[PDB]
Amino acid sequence: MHSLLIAAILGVVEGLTEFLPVSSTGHMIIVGHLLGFEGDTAKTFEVVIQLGSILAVVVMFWRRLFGLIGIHFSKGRLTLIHILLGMIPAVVLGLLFHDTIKSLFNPINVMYALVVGGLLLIAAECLKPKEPRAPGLDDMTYRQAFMIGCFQCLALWPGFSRSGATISGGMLMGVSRYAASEFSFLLAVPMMMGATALDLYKSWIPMFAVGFITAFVVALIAIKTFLQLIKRISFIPFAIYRFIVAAAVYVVFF
Ligand SMILES: CCCCCCCC/C=C\CCCCCCCC(=O)OC[C@H](O)CO
Ligand SMILES: [Hg+2]
């Protein structure tokens, strides 16, 4: 009776922490450990429900995503070249270091990426310019998009919260918190869709239906609130929250 309940608990977690700088992978290992869902099947299940979070960004940015690829229906406009430049370096670094990255998945490394990721969010807050260089999404430049991407190499460290890494570099390149968040979401669509496909390949029954779907729903609510929320809130509360999670990763496993 609780196979569906566990998937609901894991789904609301994944959908919530996927696009918030709070280390989706870190929350899953602690909750999966507290529940007892730790087998290889759990990891496969977790990659599946990541697809639901993807579709949430797909439906949230349906008009803009297809716009980048030519399916329409400041005066600049964000182009597909921005997305490509944002994902070139992580792909190149991710392809070359696959066996090495997969070795970093122990919980101790998550504890550090939780702390170090929070330090970076603080440094982005203290160091970001007073006047944003790109207050809107369509104001971004190829240099900002690429520097954000070369900054996404850190997300290959398990527990770093790819959103937190991507948004930090956005703020440090002069992109507003709102646009830096919008770009991290749009950038996650090609990244997650390809990465999960890459993970679904090497890993091979209705428990997915609950998890995939409920993660799609919660992500929509979180991703819509967070964008409206971040208009008036900083990333300091998120960075400090990652420290409380880091102690928990130590608490649950050590
Ligand atoms: C009192 C309740 C909270 C208890 C936990 C205390 C947090 C201390 C932990 C780590 C250091 C964090 C460094 C402090 C963050 C920077 C403070 C700040 O003012 O940020 C600058 C601003 O965001 C841009 O101008
Ligand atoms: Hg890089």
Author numbering: 4 to 76, 86 to 216, 224 to 273
Wording from the paper:
Responding to this critical need, we introduce here a fully automated method for collecting, selecting, and merging data from hundreds to thousands of in meso-grown microcrystals. This approach boosts the collective phasing signal of many tiny crystals to a level where de novo phasing of highly challenging membrane protein targets becomes not only possible but also fast and high-throughput. We refer to it as the in meso in situ serial crystallography—experimental phasing (IMISX-EP) method.
We demonstrated the IMISX-EP approach for both heavy atom derivatization methods with two membrane proteins, BacA and PgpB. BacA crystals were derivatized by in situ soaking with HgCl2 in IMISX wells directly. From the 968 BacA crystals identified, two groups were created with which to evaluate two phasing methods. One contained 360, the other 271 data sets. The first group was used successfully for SAD phasing with SHELXD and CRANK2.
